Amino acid sequence: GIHVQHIKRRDIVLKRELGEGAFGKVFLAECYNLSPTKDKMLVAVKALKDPTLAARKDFQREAELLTNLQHEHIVKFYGVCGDGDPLIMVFEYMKHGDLNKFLRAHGPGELGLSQMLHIASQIASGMVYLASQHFVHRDLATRNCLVGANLLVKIGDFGDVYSTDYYRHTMLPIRWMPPESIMYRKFTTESDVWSFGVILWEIFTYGKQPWFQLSNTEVIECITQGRVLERPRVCPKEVYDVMLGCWQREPQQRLNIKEIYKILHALGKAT
Template sequence: MSDNILEDIFVKRSQQKKKTSPLNYKERWFILTQEKIAYYDYDAEKMVYKGSVDLEKIKCVDLVQPEPGAPPERCFPFQIVYDEGPLYIFAKNEDIRAQWIQKLKHSRFAVKVSSMFLVDGMWLCCKQEVKQAPGCKILDGRNERPLPPKPPEPSGPSVGKSVRADYDYTPGTAQDLELKKDEEYTVLEMSDPNWWKARDKFGNEGYIPSNYVVEAKTGLERFDWYCKNMNRSQAEALLKSENKDGGFLVRDSSKAGKYTVSLFTKGGGDTIGSCKHYNICTTAQGQFYLAEKHIFSTIPDLIFYHQHNAAGMVCRLKYIVSNQTRPPSTAGLGYGVWEIDPHYLTFIKELGNGQFGVVKYGKLRGQHEVAIKMIKEGSMSEEDFIEEAKIMMKLRHENLVQLYGVCTKQRPIYIVTEYLCNGCLLTYLKEGLTQHPTMVQLLEMCKDVTEGMAYLESKQYIHRDLAARNCLVDSNGTVKVTDFGLSRYVLDDEYLPSAGSKFPVRWSPPEVLLYDKFSSKSDIWAYGVLMWEVYTLGRLPYERLNNTEIVHQVSRGLRLYRPSCDYFVFLGKVCGQTRSKARL
């Protein structure tokens, strides 16, 4: 017992793991050591261990406001917040409480904490109904460790600066401003990250989609051969689709701040053609080269030279291949527009029958390609979803399927989203890929999903049903996550995505299978299963087990087998190899 830092008898409040479980208050013997704080049931003869919290798992320690009319033994509460939620403890007096908080201060601390109790599934201070919800009170300096320095703010346009249009934009509402490719505009307001207010050279003002413009002084965006945010496999797909000997583009390298020239060639009598990738190297003086004998002060000068001279490459850069012909998706189809008039929709063909009803391909106003989910009545809590849709439309990321709007004035209601021509990832893995997809292609698919899910997590969204069937693939092979958060609005009796279960059993971790506990951590588990789907080209997880067997076996430690292919061996080798300076 000599290793104990503090010992005392406190009243402990039950964790209330379910909303329906009753509250109770029991005296426990608490012992604080260097590694953990533990509590015991005790009597004159023995102590019975009841639980503990490792100090390294503690996020914060802070006061809690006493309950109204609390009895004397519950007037000095404090909370220890860790991954599973708050542990509520009641000290005998203020001095003892302060002593314990002081000793526990060496742990890492959260930025926010709830100042009142969690009761019946609701925080009394901020009325949030999620146990893991971020707190509503910023901790004062006495309980906070210094936060790490913030990363530098990304450079980009600001109010008053000029931007250049990368794409034409036809106004969707009277509030919008028309954009003409390559013309400049002045930014007037940036309060909405997706829609900026701007002025054109004639003095006209209105809202423009922020992802259609770049800062006017930015260099490479001026050139058609530069394809920003394009990865290796997407570049290869685009170059092969053009099928021109000497077709090329310049893209961001996998190394931050570097660039790569991707070139398609049919040299040496090759009728099919292949892609070569060359890093643009930099000298100590900041000059650029592909071949060391030919050095240039700028990348455009380098590209101009190699358009006329091979100089170390398999052929010269003959044809510009660009992805700028198709503009990106906007957050909605106009500033402030989320309700879409169904008369503007043209239904062209049926794409499938999903959880919520029929999904059709169509066009909006005859020009925008869209997917239209026709929600069958009784399958969704419609009023709750409609309110949430206004927020979901503001989510914009290149690896999320964009929600354009909803049609709610009739039944069934429609959900109108971005259309991706290659369909769902699961079908694409089984049928759409070549017979032998490259390891880089599969890895890029996983990376695309990671990017989209990381953005959702940053916006405090939980997907709850991440799987290959809920990802879509566009014409360039980019994977985008869809149906994020929709499972929250499915009526219990209807949500049967996994043959008889109210949640996707094959993609669920033990805490979901046993306790229905969804979180960003359960999304990470589902992502691991999705990776398994990718590297097995769309096989069914736990294919030999039914749902009941999966719940039992996974809860006891069963995990998916390693795919029989050699992809993981390949990835291990790649991580240990040094890449050439001149080529990726």
Template sequence: MKYMTGVAAGMACLEGDGVIHRNLRCANLLISEDDTCKISDYGMGTKEDIKKGIRFPIKWTAPEAYAQQIFTSKSDVWSFGVVIYEVFSYGKEPYEGMDPREVFTNVFQEGERLSPPGECRSPWSSIMPQCFHLNPEKRPNFQTIKTQTHGGSE
């Protein structure tokens, strides 16, 4: 759980600085020698809009980012929900067995969402579904997630 609180705190910091990561997933998290979780791979992270045509991992990508290439910190929140799934399923691939077209149809058009894995406990089990609201404005921001997970302390 401490790794997840670290990711939430790191993403709250990026969000506060106006940086959109655009590629948040477990493959881009590193554990340092002092056993803290670090967010990496800022290749797509920027304060500016990215030109259309960039490739991104659909299984971690919010519907508005995939369909309209609208990236905000709220699209990073969607990805964070997928990270919660990855962590508490012990690295299981999200939407396992689905190709990108199936993910688009099942998730974006039919409303299928990842469910919290059995090992996922509060507060993560209640935060995860909030991350998957179709309307980005209804998703929590990272400061809210940080507060829910460790009182907003540094």
């Protein structure tokens, strides 16, 4: 089966808490004997706090998954740490934090069109990769993207901080979900494409919450009714057309992520 890379606990030097959740705890840390270059490098370390029996089993399958789910625009997974007490995963560190915060902090030094396209294109690139791996994310949103140096952007999936972005039972990011996911919890590459359209809207509104005006009930009604977010002020019409292509009511009518990437990448290269 899949051999997950193991990192010695003693090679991890914890530096600072980045965050906490009901389930996880994330640290910034230095890791020795990892880099091919440097002596030590920065990493992000997630330690599970007193996990269930299923949680343990879940952790191991996720580690095996992440071992090969590897791409320039997917947050880098390095391996698991220690020997289970507790369960620790080690990821690269992305020094500019989550994209939603980043967006809101550069909104009315501002992001120009070329920067917003570069951001969007990188995310679509990661999604092209995910689709090639039959991987359905289910919670694509800028809060789950991270930003590194030079506006490098990568997709993760993080376990609180954005509770408002989920609806009560497990939490669903309804504002990012298409009608068939809300109704049937049918998640596919096509519902991720729908989510990406909303990511585009987030980027071009500097990280505003979709349907901020509406209640969760009203959002369900809204999406089901086939209503869509309006074009953001600084969103070029072709980019909005891409958004609408993501928001086709019938999943098989949606643009595929390869088409979306091809368009956004060209536009970003041209501007």
